Amino acid sequence: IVGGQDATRGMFPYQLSLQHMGAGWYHTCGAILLAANKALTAAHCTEGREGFRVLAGAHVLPANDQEQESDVASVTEHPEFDRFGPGIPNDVATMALATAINAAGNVGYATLAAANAPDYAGDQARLSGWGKLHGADDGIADTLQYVVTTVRSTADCNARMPEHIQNVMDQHICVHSDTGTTGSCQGDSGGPMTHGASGSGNVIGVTSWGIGNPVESCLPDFPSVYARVSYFRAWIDAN
Amino acid sequence: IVGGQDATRGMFPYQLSLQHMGLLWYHTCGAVLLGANKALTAAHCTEGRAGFQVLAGAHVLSAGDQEQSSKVVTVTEHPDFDRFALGIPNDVATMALETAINAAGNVGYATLAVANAPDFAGDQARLSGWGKLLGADDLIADTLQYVVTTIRSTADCNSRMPEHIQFVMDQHICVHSDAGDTGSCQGDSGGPMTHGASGSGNVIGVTSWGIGNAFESCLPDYPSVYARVSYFRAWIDAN
């Protein structure tokens, strides 16, 4: 998260750390807790890989301070996900959890946007995650971050993109500040966009992509693009 | 190298594999043999690191049958190298070798561009190295690659970049194919750009940077950017 600040523990009860087994476990993406044995993330976070765990109720990743955890037993990526397609289409996946994660302590389940939700253009929303604090940094964040930003319409999103990368679609929900100073970054992918500037809010997006250059991987000068939960809600529910 | 083919051993007599000691030795960058005890690479290949060796007259890395090698005693990075500044300026370094490497067999010393050399805009050139064969691949190349491409002027270079990445400078030399299919890739940094499409050619650039995204780390749809040897020749000779 670029341009944000430390969250407090429990501020995003459904925020997960999605961990991949390399040499040992490492944070690769965010994820979103939906139910005791179900979670939601970006398809690109799991596609082509195997060996995952989610941490629930965590705050400072190097402290190993999670409250609950479960192995991921199975993953369903959207069948029309295309890692290399314009706009990274259909960048959503559900995950089945081996062990139940209970709504307790600082852990809780997200309320997803309804399929008939409005598009929220102009609304304040929050991005959260352990992604890099700046696109040039070599490491991800130690402490969970969040930032308040503004949802834009599809047309507005594309107007804010590079001229040859006008690939934002209605299946996306994009945020951008008018100062060009906040956004998501590597390590935030698969996490939640929470509606509203404060308090409890529905989860309306899943972190997916943004724009970089050779010295800064996630430019707040350009929007951050999420998979739109209302567009994918029926599919998420069916999978 | 993207869009290229297997080279032959000795095709580029001055091409080195710059190895870094981690778990075991591994290829981290290219380098360019300048003389019996001296090599050239990119500053970002050596800055902040130590414990290097160069392999000369190599071909297939897994074969381990380079003709000659040497540990590196010390490295010197350009004093104005800036990994964060637009254009990653001054990305050159020299290296002193513990063991003399002879010009013999498939190993020879580069002829560097003189400081009076022109821009070479429009000319063909060759890129060589063990970088990845595609930006979406996980691993570097096993067999040394090369590709023929076309040198572009500073202004033409920038015209072929994204509008928010107009970072090419006169201290760079860039190459780009109109078909958008050739370029350097991670693992190629530090290696040579050789003037001309065939024959003995002077070394006119050092591999430095290119455009990527989170799923494809090098994009031949945009130019590949090298440090221009003519610009840096006096520094290289003195260091």
Numbering used by the authors:
A (entry chain B), B (entry chain A): 1 to 239
Give passages from the manuscript.
Here, we introduce a small facultative plasminogen-independent thrombolytic enzyme, snFPITE, isolated from Sipunculus nudus. Compared to traditional thrombolytic agents, snFPITE does not require plasminogen for thrombolysis, although its presence enhances lytic activity. Native/SDS-PAGE, high-resolution mass spectrometry (HRMS), and ultrahigh-performance liquid chromatography (UHPLC) unveiled that snFPITE was a small monomer protein with a molecular weight of 24.925 kD. Mechanistically, snFPITE activates plasminogen and degrades fibrin(ogen) in a multisite cleavage manner. snFPITE is inhibited by plasminogen activator inhibitor 1 and α2-antiplasmin via a competitive inhibition.
Moreover, snFPITE-n2 consisted of two molecules (A and B) in an asymmetric unit. snFPITE-n2-B (molecule B) was the same as snFPITE-n1, but 28 amino acids differed between molecules A and B. These two molecules formed a heterodimer through hydrogen bonding with two separate catalytic triads available for substrates, indicating that snFPITE-n2 could function comparably to snFPITE-n1. This unique structure of snFPITE-n2 might shed light on preventing the loss of activity through dimerization or polymerization during freeze–thaw cycles. Prior to crystallization, the protein samples were treated with the serine protease inhibitor phenylmethylsulphonylfluoride (PMSF). This treatment facilitated the clear observation of electron densities corresponding to the PMSF molecule covalently bonded to Ser189 of snFPITE-n1, snFPITE-n2-A, and snFPITE-n2-B within the PMSF-snFPITE-n1/n2 cocrystal structures. High-resolution crystal structures of both snFPITE-n1 and snFPITE-n2 reconfirmed that their catalytic triads consisted of His44, Asp91, and Ser189, and the weak substrate specificity might be caused by Gly183 and Ile88 residues in the binding pockets S1 and S2, or the four additional residues (Cys, Leu, Pro, and Asp) inserted into the S1 pocket of snFPITEs. The presence of snFPITE-n1 and snFPITE-n2 implied that more snFPITE sequences might exist in S. nudus.
